[PDB]
Design a protein around this nucleic acid. Structure first.
Lengths: 74, 136, 272, 61, 38
RNA sequence: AGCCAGGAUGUUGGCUUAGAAGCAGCCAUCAUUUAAAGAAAGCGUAAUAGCUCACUGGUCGAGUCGGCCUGCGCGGAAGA
RNA sequence: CGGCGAGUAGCGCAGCUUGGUAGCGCAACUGGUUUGGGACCAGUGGGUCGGAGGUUCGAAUCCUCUCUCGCCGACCA
């Protein structure tokens, strides 16, 4: 992740899937395919605890590949 | 919209606005709008300035309006030859003399009180100034 | 007539061009693919078919309701002429229906124990109000959310026909309507906007400027889908506007969903 | 003003209908009839008896 | 611009210069703030 | 004062949860990392992002900045 | 508008002249008479006096000020 390379800064529920409705224009704001990520979003989000809002970081290149970072559920 | 509640005499003379003002110290509050001007301050001019400070405090403050109008002023219907006695009362006015304290804001911070007076004062006719509390 | 045969036939050249019917105004509703399309159509017949029917703009619905409930409005009838001394009185208690989904926006519960009102007169009291549903005493309009309860009545034992009681409801209905202040409502439109990527920001302006409330904001790979509900009346001409501010790279879908209590500023307009 | 037989229809207020004779003895002034099965006023909806009147094409089944 | 008896430092970059004896406002790049007649 | 620079963390701090991500609005106006940094004085968005400021370090290198009280001036100021 | 005159039950009018305690009529309600309605025949409730303020022990009432509605004029160039 660069300083800011159009990366989402909040998240969606820890156990839920398809972050489509709530954030809306912002997740796909980079053209991020929900397809490629939603399968892996829960991969390390279902990992610790489900349903407890956690913060995630998804910073995508122009070469279109992200870096996965998560922080403490607020 | 202050107005003497059932005074004795319906109409009264013109009088003269002279001398230095008497109520000249911050009675209750810490801040005040003391009038440097010298002139007749009507009732409407009172209400306008009041609400215009009521908003700067937004709800939170105690405000005392020192001056009371208490003086009836008369007029003449706009089609009459001069005669036929004293006219009709139209509005009330509180005489002012330089040095008279008019409003008081106590409790709110200084600058907002400073900011507050400006809004209202702009509605007042006579020039006024910002005063702060003194002991004795 | 020269329009009925024209636009009737004018439905064949462009089956994308629609001819319709104003609910109870019958004024022909015209649906096309833009003012350009319509305008051309206007003059396409101005001389080809000499069609001078001055098409204008659509018309509103504006149905009505009641602000609140009533307590005990009473309306009697004193036609004691002789031999047929019409005598009919009811004590109705009208209550607005709270937003539901029963196909009929109405609820009439019969609160009479009989004797106070002979039974076979239920339909009378019933349809008595049913008449007053086409006379909205603001501008003569239909009403919604209407819910009526009846407390008691009064009759005369050589009289009191259905006529006596069809009117008792006819009269006392507006009474509570008078007591319980009415209001003017309007259809609210469910719109699913579609504007690529950028104008998304700028599109919101008209979306909201016509007093429309953005419900859902969504997106996809190269697109955006937005949700909001906005009054039908305050939505005309939008086909032009939407493409007029997005380079035509946008379109939308629209449908009615609900009626709501419009403000008075709106209200003092339908008076006519 | 005419009579509209056929217990309902589909058309109204802008069309071409076809009249015939036939008073009604039941309404003031009315003395005529439309023709169920004619141009715009259709053959009635799925009836069997006396269907020649009311222009019902014989149900193929 | 605008004409008015009283001009003021509206925004962060408002400027005032006594150009030829006239008071006026030149912000930086904020067009809607140009004033004179001070 | 310029020219070079940093200007962040939990953390969108809950609600009206449609969104109030340092900035529509409300309450608190926290506490850590500290040469420093307000969970914010402002611009910009649907919301982010983005450009700065508060404040703090380098260089140059001396005085400089904000109120009060007066005197004398400018604007406000168009008629046959 | 100035100049005088009414504001009374539901509706319309007496009582105000000179201060003490508001009457009549059709209406409304209940019963009688009739097969029933009307008319008719017997009882009853209903204002407490337009409002603000004084005069006095006490005010529909005597004064003074507004508001509603009326009659009169707002003329000589």
């Amino acid at each position: 992740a660069k300083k800011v390379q159009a990366y989402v800064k909040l998240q969606v529920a820890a156990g839920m899937a398809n972050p489509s409705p709530p954030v809306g224009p912002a997740l796909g704001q980079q053209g991020v395919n929900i397809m490629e990520f939603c399968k892996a979003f829960n991969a390390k989000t279902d990992s610790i605890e489900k349903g407890l809002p956690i913060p995630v970081v998804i910073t995508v290149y122009a070469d279109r590949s992200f870096t996965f970072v998560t922080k403490t559920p607020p | 919209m202050l107005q003497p509640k059932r005074t004795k005499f319906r109409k009264m003379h013109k009088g003269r606005n002279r001398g230095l003002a008497q109520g000249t110290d911050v009675s209750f509050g810490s801040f005040g709008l003391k009038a440097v001007g010298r002139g007749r301050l009507t009732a409407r001019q009172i209400e306008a300035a009041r609400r215009a400070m009521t908003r700067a405090v937004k709800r939170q403050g105690k405000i005392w309006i020192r001056v009371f109008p208490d003086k009836p002023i008369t007029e003449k219907p706009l089609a009459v030859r001069m005669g036929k006695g004293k006219g009709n009362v139209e509005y009330w006015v509180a005489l002012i003399q330089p040095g008279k304290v008019l409003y008081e804001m106590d409790g709110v911070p200084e600058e907002l009180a400073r900011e507050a007076f400006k809004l209202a004062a702009a509605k007042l006719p006579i020039k006024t100034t910002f005063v702060t509390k003194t002991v004795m | 007539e020269k329009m009925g045969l024209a636009l009737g036939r004018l439905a064949k050249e462009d089956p994308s061009f629609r001819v319709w019917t104003d609910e109870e105004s019958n004024q022909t509703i015209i649906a096309g693919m833009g003012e350009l399309h319509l305008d051309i159509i206007v003059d396409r017949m101005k001389r080809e078919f000499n069609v001078e029917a001055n098409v204008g703009k659509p018309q509103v619905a504006y149905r009505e309701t009641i602000r609140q409930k009533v307590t005990d409005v009473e309306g009697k009838h004193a036609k004691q002429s002789g031999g047929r001394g019409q005598y009919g009185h009811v004590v109705i208690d009208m209550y607005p229906l709270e937003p539901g989904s029963n196909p009929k926006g109405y609820e009439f519960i019969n609160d009479i124990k009989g004797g106070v009102i002979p039974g076979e007169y239920i339909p009378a009291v019933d349809k008595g109000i049913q008449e007053q549903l086409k006379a909205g005493p603001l501008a003569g309009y239909p009403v919604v959310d209407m819910g009526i309860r009846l407390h008691f009545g009064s009759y005369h034992d050589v009289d009191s026909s259905e006529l006596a009681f069809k009117l008792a409801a006819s009269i006392a209905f507006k009474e509570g309507f008078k007591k319980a202040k009415p209001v003017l409502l309007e259809p609210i439109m469910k719109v699913e906007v579609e504007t690529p990527e950028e104008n998304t920001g700028d599109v919101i302006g008209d979306l909201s400027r016509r007093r429309g409330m953005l419900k859902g904001q969504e997106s996809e790979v190269t697109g955006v889908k937005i949700h909001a509900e906005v009054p039908l009346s305050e939505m005309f001409g939008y086909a032009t506007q939407l493409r007029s501010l997005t380079k035509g790279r946008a379109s939308y879908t629209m449908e009615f969903l609900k009626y709501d209590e419009a403000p008075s500023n709106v209200a003092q307009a339908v008076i006519e | 003003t005419s009579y509209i037989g056929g217990e309902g229809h589909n058309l109204q207020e802008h069309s071409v209908i076809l009249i015939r004779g036939g008073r009604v003895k039941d309404l003031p002034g009315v003395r005529y009839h439309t023709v169920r099965g004619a141009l715009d006023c259709s053959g009635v909806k799925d009836r069997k008896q006396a269907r020649s009147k009311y222009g019902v094409k014989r149900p193929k089944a | 611009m605008k004409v008015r008896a009283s001009v003021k430092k509206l925004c962060r970059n408002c400027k005032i210069v006594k150009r030829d004896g006239v008071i006026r406002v030149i912000c930086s790049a904020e067009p809607k703030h140009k004033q004179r007649q001070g």
